[PDB]
């Protein structure tokens, strides 16, 4: 059929109003289409397509593609975090960024290495939706919050996947919009399609109890996905975790250039009063978002939900028996992640999550390998912190 | 044999073996970090990187599938990355025709989430044929925001009253601007918290985003200022008030990089054709998702659908930095009737703080240049300084109200 | 006239005699050169408006305008349930002017709200606002939840051990131990869900319970100091920094209070026939709901509001706490309200509205509500004190008046607003 | 002797008569016979008392407990200075409980700072953080700005003529011509530069302006409409939705008060000594420092507070705001402090203490300053009224010595509450 054809013919075809055999060349008679749009066709020339697997990717991951973007992969690491050793994948085009971290990663060691927590673990969807009138949407409220509502809501939500396991409902309301905040956790995934249907089926189980209600959207932005927003910072979104490391004051003086006193006092005076004096919900950081950001797209994660996985508060305090030794945390409530689905499927993504040895599912405890992802940003965050903290107060 | 190979490497490198060099280091000879200028070419040391990377793990063949052969470490070593082992490729796909100012985009946007570029690429044909979109850049100037310390808040309050002065600020703007060709300084910004003096400079930065350049100016700025206050302390060049990759109100309020506005109107019929919906169903959804909702969840900013997924996507594609995704995503979507019969869609985003640039960082690099080069807004543009940066703005602007058309419509037509 | 300190002293001493036996001018001469500090007037002298008007006479020469008091009235006042329950130093009182907006047709019931204020046309406008809800049919609203909070701040050694703290509390059986602690404290004291939240070694712990009808603060405090005294028992390494680590959060902004509420959630509501907009409110429906989409959430979006999605709620708000007793700080939170506006009925011409004030501190025991005057005002609503068959039911009958005032305050302003000028 | 209606309302009408010719029972009588409207008795009877009392026993009637106003008084007060100026509605006056701490030591003075309020504790409290600032050696303040605003909202056709106008108020020339129109509507009138903001066709415009000793809402709303006036001649297609648009932002929470300023924006601050620290507050600089950091900045932060870095700023800016006849709504945004807390000296024992508060909004002419009783406390401080020779000098002298009165607040407090009980 179509390799029998030119590539000449087959546009001949698209243009007059009327598939492939092979991927590869689909990317190929697009990007000549789309070359027939530009003002400069020749820019497509060093924008790459040959030799990736695209058979991943179409259907599931992107469409109308015509080739893909490289971001160099830099490597912070050893990172010791709970007596394991971590080489960290990081995708950036930031000069010394990687280096900083790097050098963050160094720090921590020689303090004896960091420890994490995970303190919470659940996805959430956040639709809304209308009653008629404000006491009836309060009467729906009521009825969520007792036992015996909640418990055919956990059952309907729960009936439509493996993990799918919801966990207490959060609620609000606003005259006659009731916002239903959904959470589980999802396995290994991030979890997003997996909620959002437990949540239809869950929304549609609350119908048959209140047939006047409206679903008007199945994200009424109370998640909150993608967007700023206190409720994350406060209730948690994914995984929430806490990070922490003590670094001996020698370690301070010879490889972070600087004083445990001189650290506490730019913590205090940037992440928390500047961070203040700015008008910040959850931002009470150096630079996590760098970590973030270049972990997730190393990773295979969603790199636009760094908006809500970035939020994290740097404390540093004194410590140890001279009181010249270095107490630094980062707490982190909201990690957006996973090891399965999105990304994290194309072979590129799994060879860096294979790097942390938590690519896949974690077979024998469902979730433990996207949990061992969030404490791994979590830890390389607090050296994100702790190398450009120090950086700052030296003063350069 | 060991001691063959180290006179080797007097002479060179390129004419052992990698067996050889890796042996050199296991058996300590030579030290690790002394490989990156001893080897010659950039790709064979990201192999050497990779090997001895890979012993180390306990998987060690994790590194299989990460491509790095043939690719241009040049531009990205000593600027863009280190310790590097090699390139993540993310997928591109396009969304387009977007019609805007009279002019068509072919928006390149790199994400690995699937039906993101053909939910945009709906929103595209929905503007398209509802008469085009129009924007319009409503501000601009990258910012830093240093914290300085006086001996007591009555020093500070004295710096304050001092920097808002015609003849102060004149002789802090005179240093800012000797740093650079666009360092341009506009009106000072500050708070006064105790002692602590936050000082917030802002200035246009041609086409780059202009993190380095106002860094330099902002340097050269207070190096001034301790001339006439010795006791002020530098604690910091950034105490958080810029605000650079951190929610913040201040941007959301005060703008920082480019501030943007865009809009179009939607024909009903369009509205129910190409988007499967109506206005009033469309505008019921987006006051009580995008307003009310982003309300009742605490949002400073954040009163949109989606913004950050085409804004990370157009960013990744075309060389930014994605971690500013996080002040870059500030976004109000606004829906109301229009029309004869209020039976047509007004659709408007406004996005105060996009921080962008076609110049420096990620935009040195070739494929991100293609990407630039498919806007027609790659590189400087020599006539009018900073106008491809603005005009990517703009695309970005655009490109989302297409995401929050396409998006929301999906949204209010259920199932 | 005055005779020797020596003289006064033996006089003050003497239990038949006491501090009736000296003059205005001898108390005076004690304070000035030590012997009385300034504080043990309230339990020396004879009555409690003498000690006041002691204490004016003193203040009075340290100003710098010795008349300055002439007009701050002080006699007559029933200082006795004042002293030592609600006010310290004090020198007379400060009347302030109480309107009254009414009926306010709310559940099927009506209300002559008081309202305590000094800004000209507040009253009148509320009780224009009053009067198009009452011609609507009326308003209906609900509590939507009920727990006065607070959140002290502990610390444990590690990030890790305030992790595992969290993680017990979280347990059904380390709630439980916590939750018979707390509610050993007080009949009213009902633990319910724990909120947590950790800073590294730092976790904030937000106690909530239901507190009669009675605001509750002191009644959680108690409750939360037991609370935590027995949660060291099973974690001896835990430090109490503070009784309140500003997680509650008290008489400040902040979100969780926005969120998850505090004291009383409130919604309210009504529909405004197109008729009674059009006469009374001097606008349209259609107007108003474009002036409250653009003003009360768009403009306060790009003000970066949190909780402050309306017009002005903190008049109400304020007024009815001075004049019935509450605490009148704590309207820095209670005033947090969305004001909704929407088409409705068959033309789709008649106004909708609704108020939702998630966290109305409010008590009609305790405090201010001990006071007469402001009893009286209490009484007006008839939520004054204690509700004996259903304890709780007068604080949450008047967080439903607040919020009910506040709906019918931002009709009005809305409409005002809306006609221009 | 109560007359038929016919006869009462003869004698009503009868203009050297009057509602003084009749009885209470006889106009109360005319009034539930529907021939008076409720709202005109404040016209027509010639006493203001009177129209108290009368409004009084018709409200008592429909109360469910008839006596309910007995404890609330009404008599011998100034409703002159009340009446069509700051309540209406008027049945009587609630009394708080005005208290003084100090001396509070700042600027090389002395104050006495008057606090109405019904909280336990407070002034005492309050009363003891002056008393470490006095022996500390006093407290140093500046005001760092000063301007009220207003910020309306307008709507262009299209987004295109919003940034069209937006681009045109930042001319010097455009700005300069609304300027002029601004300032001609009052001597105090001084238009800083324009803060603006668009959300798709709407504009949101932030007029700020200095407004000598009065608060100023009257006077920049006034100076805001002439000044919209002028830019509709420019751009006729412009729509004036609503005189505030919430971008003022006035008694509602606001990250643009925070960050702008509102008001007085002001800065206090004072070193304690380490012997103060310990006898006056019975605590160490180190133990004050560890609950301030993780209560007042960490703790708000976890919360999600905008501007609420502080203890309980509210509750003194709250007495003081009633005591000295300001809108106690206000206190909203006017609490609005952070408190921070360093060790200061050569062994980390002395605590250095600011609190920062960048929107007080406060004056010292018009609303209830124009009261007696609130112009006595208002004479105490030595703000009362205008400054003639330096016009808004009482003003920002109320607003330093506000900022510096929570400063003492937040010593107290702090100290207390690192100690435990
Ligand atoms: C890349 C690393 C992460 C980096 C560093 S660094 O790695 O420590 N040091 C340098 C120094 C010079 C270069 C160069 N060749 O231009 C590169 C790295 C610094 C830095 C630190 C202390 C200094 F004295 C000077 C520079 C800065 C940096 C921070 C705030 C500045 F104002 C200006 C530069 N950044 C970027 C952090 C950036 O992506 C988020 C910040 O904007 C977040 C924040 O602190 O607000
Ligand atoms: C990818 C696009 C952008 C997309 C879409 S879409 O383009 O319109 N349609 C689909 C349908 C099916 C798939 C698939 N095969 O998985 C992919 C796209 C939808 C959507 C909308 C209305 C619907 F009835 C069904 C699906 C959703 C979506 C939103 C909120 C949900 F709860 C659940 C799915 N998303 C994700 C948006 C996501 O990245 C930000 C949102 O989380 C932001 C928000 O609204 O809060
Ligand atoms: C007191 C009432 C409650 C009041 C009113 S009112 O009830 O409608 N009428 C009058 C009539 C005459 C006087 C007088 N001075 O003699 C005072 C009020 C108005 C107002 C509003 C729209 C108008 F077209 C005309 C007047 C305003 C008011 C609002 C925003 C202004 F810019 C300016 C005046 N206020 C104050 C509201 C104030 O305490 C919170 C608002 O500032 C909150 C906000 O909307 O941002
Ligand atoms: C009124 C004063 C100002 C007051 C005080 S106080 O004046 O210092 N001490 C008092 C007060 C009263 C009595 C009484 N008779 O029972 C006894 C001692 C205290 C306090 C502090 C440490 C303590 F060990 C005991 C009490 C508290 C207080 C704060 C947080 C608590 F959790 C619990 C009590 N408050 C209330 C502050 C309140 O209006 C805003 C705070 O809630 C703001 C905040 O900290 O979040």
Known sequence: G??????????????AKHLIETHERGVSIRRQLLSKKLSEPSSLQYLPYRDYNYSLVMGACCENVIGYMPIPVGVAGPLCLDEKEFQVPMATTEGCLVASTNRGCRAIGLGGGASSRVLADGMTRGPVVRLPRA????????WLETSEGFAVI??????TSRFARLQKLHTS???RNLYIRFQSRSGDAMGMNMISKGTEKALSKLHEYFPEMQILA?????????????????EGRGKSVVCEAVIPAKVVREVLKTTTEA?????????????????SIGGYNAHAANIVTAIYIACGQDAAQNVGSSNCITLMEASGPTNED?????????????????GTNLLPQQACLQMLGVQGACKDNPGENARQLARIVCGTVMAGELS????????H
């Open 2 to 15: 179509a390799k029998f054809l030119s590539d000449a013919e087959i546009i001949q075809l698209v243009n």
């Open 135 to 142: 006491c009836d949407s309060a009467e729906v409220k009521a």
């Open 154 to 159: 956990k059952e309907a939500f729960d009936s």
């Open 173 to 175: 309301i606003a005259g």
């Open 218 to 234: 199945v994200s009424g932005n109370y998640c909150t996905d993608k967007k700023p927003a206190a409720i994350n910072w406060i």
């Open 263 to 279: 650290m506490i006092e730019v913590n205090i005076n940037k992440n928390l009063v500047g961070s203040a004096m700015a008008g």
């Open 326 to 342: 270095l107490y630094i945390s980062c707490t982190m409530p909201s990690i957006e992640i996973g090891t399965v689905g999105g």
């Open 388 to 395: 450009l903290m120090a950086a700052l107060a030296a003063g």
